[PDB]
């Protein structure tokens, strides 16, 4: 016997207290060690309802990440409001680490174990845990990186598909590696991402087929973002302390979704490194130091896609999707979907 409730959580990790990397440093003083012997209890005959779009766990993880970035990344100048803030900006060690979210005494986290779970509705197979699985706080747009994969089928997550203001979350069942590199030694900000087109387009085709199932077999078409800052019009993410901006036009090639040459092979996305960025915290802009010397390389697993559907009329022929992102709560929802906090009464 229990009921839904909200409570102040606490985090756990396997961060080392000696590491100079920012995620480890923060997790050392803000979190507790990971439970050596975690407990999980299955609940037979229990059909509990979940709702990933109204889960206070999401709001609390966001607050942690806000806190993490605020005291980790030190920009040279901070363009917030009318005032400008000049300060020291040393380059830092940056690599996200898994974080477990746990309930205090008196509460417990219900976990849905349905393979075909789209974030909402009931769950025939429910278990109970003290802490969630290790979740890396990877802040990125358009493409979800280093996350978890869906079992069995690809999952399209949305509160209301008719609500075109809402961001759609595609949950892949097969990871696709993206290879971003800033070569050493002559634009020091020029970069590029390598992606296996044969693997990617094969996946992307399956995504459209899944989108067809949600839209009366209509024609699925991808288009570049209609507008916005470079952080969302391009695939943006942080690699080794440097902010990358990659063009995803080639990642949504409708031609490649419909046995041709040029779609098979290594796709190369042109990327840029910007010192002046827009803060996702909504604070404003922040200028950083020029990129470090040497080879800057990141290899990530694309585990999900953020999409935004178009509105209007005069269609009936096709549905148009554009690469979404911007509100990082979506990122956490893509991982905190199978969890919810309940109070044992």
């Amino acid at each position: 016997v229990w009921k839904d409730a909200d409570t102040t959580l606490f985090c756990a990790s396997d961060a080392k207290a000696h590491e100079t990397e920012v995620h480890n440093v923060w997790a050392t003083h803000a979190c507790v060690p990971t439970d050596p012997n975690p407990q999980e209890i299955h609940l037979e005959n229990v059909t509990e309802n979940f709702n990933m779009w109204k889960n206070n766990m999401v709001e609390q993880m966001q607050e942690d990440v806000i806190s993490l970035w605020d005291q980790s990344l030190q920009p040279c100048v901070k363009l917030t409001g009318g005032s400008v803030i000049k300060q020291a900006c040393p380059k830092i060690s940056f690599d996200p680490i898994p974080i477990h979210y746990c309930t205090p005494a008196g509460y417990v986290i219900l976990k849905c174990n349905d393979k075909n779970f789209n974030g909402t509705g009931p769950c025939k197979n429910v278990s109970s845990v003290q802490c969630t699985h290790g979740i890396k706080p990877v802040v990125s747009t358009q493409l979800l990186l280093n996350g978890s994969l869906a079992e069995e089928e690809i999952i399209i997550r949305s509160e209301n598909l008719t609500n075109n203001a809402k961001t759609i979350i595609v949950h892949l069942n097969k990871s696709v590696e993206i290879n971003c590199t800033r070569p050493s030694n002559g634009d020091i900000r020029k970069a590029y991402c390598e992606i296996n087109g044969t693997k990617w387009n094969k996946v992307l085709k399956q995504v459209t087929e899944k989108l067809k199932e949600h839209f009366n077999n209509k024609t699925i078409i991808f288009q570049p973002p209609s507008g916005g800052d470079l952080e969302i019009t391009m695939h943006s993410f942080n690699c080794r302390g440097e902010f990358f901006y990659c063009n995803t036009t080639q990642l949504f090639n409708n031609t490649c979704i419909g046995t041709m040459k040029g779609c098979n092979g290594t796709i190369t996305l042109p990327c840029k490194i910007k010192q002046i960025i827009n803060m996702w915290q909504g604070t404003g802009q922040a200028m950083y130091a020029p990129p470090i010397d040497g080879k800057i390389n990141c290899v990530s697993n694309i585990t999900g896609i953020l999409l935004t559907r178009d509105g209007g009329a005069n269609n009936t022929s096709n549905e148009t999707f554009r690469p979404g992102g911007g509100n990082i709560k979506d990122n956490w929802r893509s991982e905190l979907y199978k969890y919810k906090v309940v109070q044992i009464e």
Partner: antibody
Amino acid sequence: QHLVQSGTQVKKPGASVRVSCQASGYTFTNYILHWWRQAPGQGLEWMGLIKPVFGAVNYARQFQGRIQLTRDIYREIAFLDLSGLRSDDTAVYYCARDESGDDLKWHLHPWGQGTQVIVSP
Amino acid sequence: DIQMTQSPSSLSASVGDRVTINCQAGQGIGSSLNWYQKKPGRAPKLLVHGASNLQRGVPSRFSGSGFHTTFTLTISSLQPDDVATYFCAVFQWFGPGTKVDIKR
């Protein structure tokens, strides 16, 4: 909790127009703005939405290639740019705030007082 | 599109009387329906959101109810400043509207 829009403007057919929307009372970066217009003897039609954080937008299918929604996160003011003006574009243009916030439930409050745009030779 | 229908098209009632405005849906909506008051020369005014929740500032004489397809806005005591067209709306989809004046 106020949204003040720019004064009424008159444009020749084929020109362009920019309409501003000055937010006042609330935390500007916390809520989504929608844009609407109502022609005389017509119902309200949605033109697009804008998300103040990164300037993310969602234009109505019939205005794409003409409409540009922008904002100033510091001045806390939204803008609407419509080019290739026609006679049927003569309407009262509104900007409204989604008071629901992050969960995007289209709870529209408050609204702008409405900017009249007249397209005539 | 989401099909929106309001009945009746226009409505008359004396001051202090009860008025119910109906709104139909072409498909399931749940509670995602809002109500707006529209006067000429004035911006739309949110009265009821989430089907039944009253917007802050709006007098309690206004009442919302409904689910799935059927929805109803009720005015317990009609006042002369309630003379306006009333719209039920789902996201960007607005109903045809319902004019309401004071009966004499």
